[PDB]
Amino acid sequence: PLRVPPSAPARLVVLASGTGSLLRSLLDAAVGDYPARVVAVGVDRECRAAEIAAEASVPVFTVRLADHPSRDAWDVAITAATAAHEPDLVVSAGFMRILGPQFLSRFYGRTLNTHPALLPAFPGTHGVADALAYGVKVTGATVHLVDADTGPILAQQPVPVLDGDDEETLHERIKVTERRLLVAAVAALATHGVTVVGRTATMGR
Amino acid sequence: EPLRVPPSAPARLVVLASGTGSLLRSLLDAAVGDYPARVVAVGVDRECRAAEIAAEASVPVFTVRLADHPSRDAWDVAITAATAAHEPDLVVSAGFMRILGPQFLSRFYGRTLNTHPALLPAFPGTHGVADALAYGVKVTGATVHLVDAGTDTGPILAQQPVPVLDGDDEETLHERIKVTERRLLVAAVAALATHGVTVVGRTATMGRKVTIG
Ligand SMILES: [Mg+2]
């Protein structure tokens, strides 16, 4: 079984490819007595997340797939760059590349993703549209461990579907909850650690 | 064409049951004072605690047994006639151990309600609680939905989430869900009676209040 010990005060690396809205919430939370700090942000392209990091005086590293001869070579480089910061936890919810086997060898159990549905319902890139089309009244957000997207679930929180929602309005309501849930899960993992038996992840004492 | 079920308050409710009648008890407890429906009859297909509970509350009980008819279709005609005889506005069949047939649904689709101890479409079937626990979800819940020709597939009327706590076993989680499930059904019956519902595609939308007010 997977055992990840507590790491508070924890070092967090955020991997990002996009607008950095989640990074904003992490940076805002990760101050004072919050049990982690964002020590670095890694990106694979120019993006607003890199700008948000730099504005917060957080080091930014860039590892572009295009700068390496193969995905295996890129995997080694991003693993080395991330490991260089000695992270206890990695958030890759906003990262738009698949993390490879070298990265997972080092960071499985410590790498977190989010999804805008209550997994296992509505998996994939269109989970919000799919939930809306199905006519559910409750959807939600999931934080789960990254693996080789059905990794062990760390945390979930429900979100209502309101009569007359479109994809954009529902997705935005879910994203609001996703940010809070991720911030809470990072803190819990830092302070409590996690153990995984079967596919069930349990926060420690 | 959207299916439109108009308001029916003060509504007549028929409950179809085969078991211990826990949901029936919740409905009988709720259907007092200003509650916008009353249980007018309970239909069963066998001797069961639900039938005893109804009688104890002075509610008529009707019995339509599979064995008393020459075919499933004959039984379907009989239970449809028996249910319709009570002029119900709504039918609850969550505790009923028979698939309702096409004759019944021809009359009562849109007015017949079931419940499920998961947030459909997750964890369908008779092991929804055990399966949610084994999968390691942190949020499950209860669903009220319209009965149709499938199982666990009809338009969703209401849902409410229920947390999964560290150390839960199937029975502890199921207790937590069942409490929410019965309440959700009682609330959905009241909303349907007062406001009606419209179904477009597979999306069911309750009617809205006409004043704040
Ligand atoms: Mg059911």
UniProtKB/Swiss-Prot annotation, chain A:
Pathway connected to this protein: Purine metabolism; IMP biosynthesis via de novo pathway; N(2)-formyl-N(1)-(5-phospho-D-ribosyl)glycinamide from N(1)-(5-phospho-D-ribosyl)glycinamide (10-formyl THF route): step 1/1
Pfam families noted in UniProt: Formyl_trans_N (PF00551)
Raises pKa of active site His, annotated site positions: 149
UniProt xrefs under CDD domains: FMT_core_GART
Signal peptide: none
Keywords tagged on the record: Purine biosynthesis, Transferase
Catalysis performed (reactions): N(1)-(5-phospho-beta-D-ribosyl)glycinamide + (6R)-10-formyltetrahydrofolate = N(2)-formyl-N(1)-(5-phospho-beta-D-ribosyl)glycinamide + (6S)-5,6,7,8-tetrahydrofolate + H(+)
Protein name as it appears in the record: Phosphoribosylglycinamide formyltransferase
Lineage of origin: Bacteria, Bacillati, Actinomycetota, Actinomycetes, Mycobacteriales
